[PDB]
């Protein structure tokens, strides 16, 4: 098959390939990129989303989060504390500060070792979930603010705006700030652009193994699992690569550098950390292939106002011949995680 090793792939589009976003996503799926659950896309050298990052010092981070982490033997739970609002300027000064700055290191493996060794000490501040875009109005290629995929149907046909899902979010990171193991809301795709600063490292589990990771997590955290089946959607659970390896969960790792895109795929579990002060922009998107994942997604029961997207409009428009069955609860379709989105047909 295409990428039978399910290893994270990197792509280097020309400007002409880069211009149509949905089409290029269909292309990288025709190359098997989706099997890893994560892919890197390096934009053309000529392309920039913004001329300068030195005029954003006045941007407000309304709800910075201090990340407290408790655990041992590769298994941790992360607790957020909302701090008072601060500007990018203040944040940047705390991030580049000596008590929170990146430690000295040679190779990525050393930094990774220090991350997993020091995870629970000196809790950092994450500049997370900031509504906004650092793109300039005029940039029409891979603009995270408007990607023009079928996810837009939630807005255009239904008038529903879900912040960070069909709208962009900014993330100002510092060393050791983390994102816990999760798939996207409604098992959507996500896109992530690192605007500037130090790298972001990522771990990914192939969608075809996602259930193995869930059973693993349920084993380690039975109480959490008993309270909510989808408790990983709480984005509190950290699990080291050593534990993944010990229990035989296939995974891959990759480091994203400023100027690079990461794409996560439906039901791709991923987690990671920031190397130092940086800024990333992201949102969710969809393709036709997502619709079945959306229909099957297991959602958090226990919490108030979690993201729940009505699938009705999608089934109605793109699967009319299955709509009656689906409404009746009789749609028994089984997802094959290896298959590319239909749109890939012309490349295959």
């Amino acid at each position: 098959t295409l990428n039978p090793s399910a290893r994270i792939m990197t792509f280097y589009p020309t400007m002409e390939e880069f211009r149509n976003f949905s089409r290029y996503i269909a292309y990288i799926e025709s190359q098997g990129a989706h099997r890893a659950g994560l892919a890197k896309v390096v934009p053309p050298k000529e392309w920039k989303p913004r001329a300068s990052y030195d005029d954003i010092d006045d941007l407000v981070i309304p709800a910075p989060i201090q990340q407290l982490v408790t655990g041992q033997s590769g298994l941790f739970t992360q607790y957020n504390i909302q701090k008072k609002a601060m500007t990018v300027r203040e944040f940047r000064k705390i991030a580049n500060s000596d008590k929170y700055c990146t430690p000295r290191y040679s190779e990525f493996e050393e930094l990774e070792r220090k991350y997993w060794k020091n995870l629970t000490f000196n809790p950092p501040i994450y500049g997370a979930d900031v509504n906004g875009t650092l793109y300039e109005k005029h940039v029409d290629e891979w603009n995270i603010g408007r990607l023009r995929t079928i996810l837009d149907l939630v807005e255009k046909e239904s008038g529903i705006t879900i912040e960070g899902v069909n709208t962009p979010y900014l993330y100002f990171g510092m060393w050791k700030t983390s994102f816990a193991w999760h798939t996207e809301d409604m098992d959507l795709y996500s896109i992530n652009y690192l605007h500037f600063g130090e790298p972001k490292s990522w771990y990914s589990v192939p969608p075809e193994h996602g259930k193995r990771l869930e059973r693993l997590a349920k084993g380690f955290f039975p109480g959490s699992a008993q309270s909510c089946e989808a408790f990983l959607r709480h984005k509190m659970t950290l699990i080291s690569p050593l534990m993944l390896k010990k229990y035989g969960i296939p995974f891959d790792k990759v480091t994203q550098e400023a100027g690079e895109f990461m794409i996560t795929f439906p039901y791709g579990y991923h987690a990671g950390f920031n190397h130092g002060f940086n800024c990333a922009e992201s949102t969710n998107f969809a393709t036709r292939r997502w619709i079945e994942y959306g229909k099957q997604a297991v959602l958090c029961s226990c919490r108030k106002d979690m993201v729940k997207i009505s699938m009705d409009v999608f089934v109605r428009k793109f699967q009319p011949e299955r709509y009656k069955l689906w409404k009746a609860g009789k749609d028994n379709t089984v997802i094959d995680h290896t298959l590319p989105t239909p749109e890939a047909a012309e490349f295959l």
């Binding site: 979930d129 879900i162 912040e163 960070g164 899902v165 106002d305 979690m306 993201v307």
Partner: peptide
């Protein structure tokens, strides 16, 4: 409802 939003992302968190």
């Amino acid at each position: 409802a939003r992302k968190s």
